[PDB]
């Protein structure tokens, strides 16, 4: 559905990658705290 | 090469960031398993 649909496609991909990113941050903080 | 080329540019950046994201997930899982 054109360039406009592809822009919504990419925004949704970025938003979901951000959820993944915050999960990886959470995990790193959990582990750092246990080690240090 | 216009808006269409820039959309392919951004999709490729997102896709490669996803490969990085899955590598960081792998590392966190490796470490969590060893600690816990």
């Amino acid at each position: 559905s054109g360039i406009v649909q592809q822009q919504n496609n990419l925004l949704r991909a970025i938003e979901a990658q951000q959820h993944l990113l915050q999960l990886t941050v959470w995990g790193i903080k959990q582990l750092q705290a246990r080690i240090l | 090469s216009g808006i269409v080329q820039q959309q392919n540019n951004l999709l490729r950046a997102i896709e490669a960031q996803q490969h990085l994201l899955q590598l960081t997930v792998w590392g966190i899982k490796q470490l969590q398993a060893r600690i816990l």
Partner: peptide, 29 residues
Amino acid sequence: WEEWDKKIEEYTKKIEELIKKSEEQQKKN
């Protein structure tokens, strides 16, 4: 860590689906 595993899997499949969808939209353009 159980909820972490479930959300990682949830968002990974969501992102994979969005990337495929965008690839199909890109080849059309």
